[PDB]
């Protein structure tokens, strides 16, 4: 979905 | 009975918060997506894990899965309500109770994760997780949408080292 490239969510399935 | 059933039960109960939250966001005309709130939640959970000497990256991957699964339920509801806005159900007066429930269930999941860390890192984890999902799908009456969400939410459990 939405996330910045340094966000935690950016490291995972998204 | 699976040793992972209490954890999976807690994850499914946490998935259920998607419905009041979706109803509230629909009536209040709020976006489902909130990437800044997700970052703050995951950072906090990583610090809760570190406080307990649990591997923070394992925990934040698990909870990112859980949050994605919760959001998936909300998007599915919005699809239904776009087709028929009259079916959007009465929403809670506010989300304070949902915030409390999420905090409680976060803590229940993290404590179950540590309590069963040896199993989550063990070869039998996958089998034990399959059993747990089956039982929780029965005991919580989970339909196809929640079954798929539970699979997504639990997909990284058997990654513990």
**Is the CB of B68 less than 8 angstroms away from the CB of A13?**
yes
Task: Tell whether B71 is within 8 A of chain A (Cβ).
Answer: yes
**Is the CB of B39 less than 8 angstroms away from the CB of A8?**
yes
Report the distance separating Cα A13 and Cα B64, nearest Å.
Answer: 9
**Residue B55 zone, left/alpha/beta (φ > 0; ψ -120 to 50; rest):** beta
Report the distance separating Cα B147 and Cα B24, nearest Å.
Answer: 23
Question: Domain limits at B55?
Answer: 5-159
Report the distance separating Cα B149 and Cα B2, nearest Å.
Answer: 20
Report the distance separating Cα B150 and Cα B15, nearest Å.
Answer: 8
CATH number of the CATH domain containing B105: 1.20.59.10
Number of Cβ within 10 Å of residue B18's Cβ equals: 23
Find the length of chain A. Answer: 14
Structure solved using which method? X-ray
Taking CA atoms, B87 is separated from B28, B63, B71, B81, in Å, by 15, 30, 19, 6
Task: Decide if B68 contacts A13 (C-beta within 8 A).
Answer: yes
Task: Tell whether B47 is within 8 A of chain A (Cβ).
Answer: no
Residue B134 DSSP class: H
Task: Tell whether B49 is within 8 A of chain A (Cβ).
Answer: no
Rounded to the nearest angstrom, the gap between the alpha carbon of residue B54 and the centroid of all alpha carbons in its chain is 19
**Domains: count for chain B:** 1
Task: Give the distance from residue A5's alpha carbon to the nearest chain B alpha carbon, in angstroms.
Answer: 11
Q: Suggest the residue from A7, A8, A11, A13 to mutate for an interface test with chain B (most B CBs closer than 10 A).
A: A8
**Is the CB of A12 less than 8 angstroms away from the CB of B46?**
no
Nearest CA in chain A to B42: A8
DSSP B45-79: HHHHHHHTT--HHHHHHHHHHHHHHHHHHHHHHHH
């Amino acid at each position: 979905x939405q996330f910045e490239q340094w966000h935690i969510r950016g490291r995972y399935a998204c | 009975t699976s040793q992972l059933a209490e954890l999976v039960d807690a994850a499914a109960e946490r998935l259920e918060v998607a419905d009041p939250v979706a109803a509230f966001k629909w009536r209040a005309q709020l976006p489902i997506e909130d990437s800044g709130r997700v970052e703050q939640q995951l950072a906090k959970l990583g610090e809760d894990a570190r406080s307990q000497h649990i591997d923070p990256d394992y925990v934040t991957r698990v909870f990112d899965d859980q949050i994605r699964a919760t959001e998936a339920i909300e998007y599915s509801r919005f699809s239904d309500w776009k087709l028929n806005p009259a079916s959007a159900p009465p929403e809670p007066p506010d989300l304070s109770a949902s915030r409390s429930a999420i905090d409680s269930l976060n803590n229940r999941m993290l404590s179950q994760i540590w309590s069963h860390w040896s199993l989550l890192s063990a070869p039998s984890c996958a089998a034990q997780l399959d059993r747990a999902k089956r039982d929780i799908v029965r005991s919580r009456h989970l339909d196809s949408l929640y079954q798929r969400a539970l699979t997504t939410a639990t997909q990284s459990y058997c990654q513990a080292l």
